Design a protein around this ligand. Sequence first.
Ligand code: ATP
Ligand code: MG
Ligand code: MG
Lengths: 598, 598
Amino acid sequence: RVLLCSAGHSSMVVPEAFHAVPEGFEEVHVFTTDSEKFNPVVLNDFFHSLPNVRFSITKCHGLADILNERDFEFYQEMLWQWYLTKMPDNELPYVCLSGGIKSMSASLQKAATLFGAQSVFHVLADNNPRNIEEMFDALQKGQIHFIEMGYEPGWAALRRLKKILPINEGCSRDNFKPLISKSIEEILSNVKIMASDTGKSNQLPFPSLAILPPIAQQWLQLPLSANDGAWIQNLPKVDLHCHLGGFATSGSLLDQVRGAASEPDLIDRTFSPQEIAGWPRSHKSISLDKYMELGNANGSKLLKDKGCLIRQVELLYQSLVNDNVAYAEIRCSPNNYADKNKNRSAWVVLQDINDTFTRLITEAKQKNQFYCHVNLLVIASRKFSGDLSDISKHLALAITAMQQGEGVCRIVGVDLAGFENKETRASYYEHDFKAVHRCGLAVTAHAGENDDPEGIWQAVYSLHARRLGHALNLLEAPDLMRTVIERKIGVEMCPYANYQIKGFAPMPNFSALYPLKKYLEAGILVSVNTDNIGISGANLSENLLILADLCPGISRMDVLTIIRNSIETAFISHDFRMELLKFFDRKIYDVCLISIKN
Amino acid sequence: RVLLCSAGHSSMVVPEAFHAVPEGFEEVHVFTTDSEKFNPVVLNDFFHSLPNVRFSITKCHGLADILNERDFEFYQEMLWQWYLTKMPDNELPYVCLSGGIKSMSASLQKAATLFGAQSVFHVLADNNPRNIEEMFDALQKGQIHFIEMGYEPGWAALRRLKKILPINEGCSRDNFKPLISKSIEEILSNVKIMASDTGKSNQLPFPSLAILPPIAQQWLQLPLSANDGAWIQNLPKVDLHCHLGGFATSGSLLDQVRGAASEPDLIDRTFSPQEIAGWPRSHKSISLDKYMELGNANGSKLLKDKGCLIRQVELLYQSLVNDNVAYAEIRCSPNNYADKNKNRSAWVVLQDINDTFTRLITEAKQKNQFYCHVNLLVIASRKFSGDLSDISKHLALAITAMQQGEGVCRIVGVDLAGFENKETRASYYEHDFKAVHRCGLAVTAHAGENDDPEGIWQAVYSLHARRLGHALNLLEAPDLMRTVIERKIGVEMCPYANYQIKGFAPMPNFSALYPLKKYLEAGILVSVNTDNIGISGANLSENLLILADLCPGISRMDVLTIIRNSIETAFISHDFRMELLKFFDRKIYDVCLISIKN
Ligand SMILES: Nc1ncnc2c1ncn2[C@@H]1O[C@H](COP(=O)(O)OP(=O)(O)OP(=O)(O)O)[C@@H](O)[C@H]1O
Ligand SMILES: [Mg+2]
Ligand SMILES: [Mg+2]
């Protein structure tokens, strides 16, 4: 534990403060003015007699004493900076103020009641000793009193400034930056709002956003622009549509993933994807057959090798972490990644993926970096070319994948993905799903891509699906939005992928307007995703960035509420959801405040 | 404008403090200990030169100096009490902090931070003035210096703490009661309670709850007690399960209704209740049966006519408004009140109810009062043996009612209540609801009070229900418990009804405990309701009050979360939900900042 104090003429207050806790203090630091009256020799001797306790002195350099308003405000600002930079990262610190004249004592007490303190107290000696040999017996005689006027909690989030303002070392009065002004204006202009409006208080998610100063709060409501990309890079994000096999399809990713293949003889390195003019900003709509022929370079031909798959998983995890993503669900198809000649069953492949992800999560968590949680989603394919029984296999595997349970990464549910050419919607597979919901899994459904808005109703009701894929043409069925919104049914959508494959504004000759803003206005639980991280040629950061051009007039509150919806619609447990929400709220406050100070 | 300060050995601080604002002042008060060093002559002579203002001196009897813990606590108690009784009625005062030694400085700074002050400031003069002429010259020279720490909004609930104890007519050490120290120890006990608590600390209900002072939040963390009735009485609330047919059934509440009978003859006036002793605190648990006979004073027998029904609905709306319920839904079964001979069809009854509700709402809205928006629920009671075809009729009625659309009040869904049994589960009526879901209706299911778990599973998966009634036995089937949590299927539970039916808050010979605390901890979107108002003999406010003795260890923040859940699972459109959220956040912030003083 740590304590803070200020000393003036009374140079022996610090040893009395150290004796406050019978257990014994661990860190002692004192902030004092430039006055020569304070004697560092006695304190240095006392703290060298107890080397086990860390010791550090900071001094208000350039100000011997306070005599005008400027001296007081400079000293108070330096004191607040010192308190901010010297408080413990997690626990609140202890405070003593028995030394110093009324000015510094009051300033540090207001600091304690502003920044929070573990325990604030005073020491008073009846015999007012001067050297150690006197208060030794004074505390032995009991004349020394350790008074406590009460614990002070302080604001729940007002030490977070320790990150937004690079606690700078200090500065001559000419190089003056008023942190005092920032704290005062934030407190005032967020309290000088009364109970009138205060409407945007609830209209915003992440309830700590209200505490954010209005100097940036009104900046949040301004329409989004393509120049704010740096900011959204620092935003913690959530991805729900990221195919595992859709990562290494272009760039040096291909070279690195093929270099990790155990046998380079079988891999056909000659095949290369065809480039599209202006990619990812294509000048025309790209057909779906063109979509997975562009993605035909990746798939299952090269990931059959165990080492190649391991390297792909590690590279995808590294790309996820480097993009400030905090949570992700990865769609995988183990059946495609299995073979019997080398005796690699699909269950073995899924177990290997799970082990790789949990090992990466644990190794990232041990060293306390920013790591992204990953959960898996087994693909129950449309199963082209007959042999329908395969799908049932997948479902069974899914159940037996969930019952393993133990680990940090888990199989949260199944998927219903495939071509819309066969017109098969819900009823063509409904004969099997009377057991997945019984187990306790979750069912998504990529439907409504280019077909009628009818089968989506069966997907919502007959399948009890909790999320929907794409479905950009929901505007033609208001009776469908009624049940979509009323049921709190989430919707996943990937602006880059669907924009490339179908075409939207502002691309000329395409008059269809992108409905994401309309969906948000209607209240649909919308979640922006990446679909195929590699083939689409754009990660989640640019995928969210492009909305400033795809849907003009979109605001930053919209981006934050999409993030909130993506958090809400994830297939996660309750306690994990709250933990994720708390971490996301703290980090979102941090970034949204650091951004405006630049 | 008032000046609040403490003077010890120094008496020259007060003239400078008065001369702080060039505009002058009107009132000055000074507190002091029993120290004989303090001389009052100088201040009296100075203030007599300005008779237009009022001056006073406060002396701490029997305390000359602070030498130990008892002296410190005594001085703190009397200074806090004196500062509280000198509080101006509606305006924050100005505080001076350059008198005495640092102890009173820190104590009164803490007092100013807690109770609030217009502006706290310190004086300082180089010459250290002693008498009148020389300090007047010092003020003329401009050598006087004034430093204002900042305007403190203050915590606005310790104000009419004056109203209970303004002054204990000169309290002595033999009769001193440090009530302010009791409040401080209350907050300290809250701190040592919540210092190792997770879960709840996550996500306040609505935002703008964080802008409250930290003391307010710390108070909010305190577990709720039976003494906090007035706070929730002022608190806006929401009802979702209220029976119209059981509002007035005892006391004088049915007298004015029956009194307003259209045909004052066929109205029986001889029925009596079952002479229940402990109602609504009845320790003896009675199991159904006696309920319907107890409520026979109202219902079908009395609601056949028109005037009585209008009087009953007006009285119910008045009671709803009186309890600060900002939104509620009422269960009703119009086919039970229809009279074919008098041309009063079921549709006629429903139209009359809707029209009177919307007229009352419009009348309340015209006067800019606290109008309670009310929506309707039609009950498809499981009459079973008697002409089950009527069931379909009821559903048809609903589909034909909400279609009319226009009006503030509407029929938003159906209720599947009735004789819950092995047969009467969701397994025979599910053929008919194909229509209901196609018309944007919401379906509840009163089940689980005596039914098996698989019946609840069918209800939540076959009828696509969105809320459940009672359902007190969810802890015995963790699988359906989880499928309730992660599907966001709300649970309506009535505390008083289940208390009088089953056994919790142990009466003699019963040890079963209410699971509401476990329900909330697990993350279910639980919602406290009333079922019936009359027969239960308790409105919503007492229903929430009884929770303190029903589920000990529940905190008021969880009560706010319960309100949020209630306003989350209500069947309403998104925009109306947002507006309702705004109004609720406003009223709750105002309540917790103003009326929480008790
Ligand atoms: N569910 C989570 N998801 C991602 N990261 C988490 C999660 N839980 C904890 N962490 C990590 O715990 C660490 C705690 O950090 P800490 O409280 O010390 O704040 P900080 O060091 O000032 O800034 P930062 O949050 O960036 O580390 C965070 O870095 C965070 O990445
Ligand atoms: Mg996809
Ligand atoms: Mg009922």
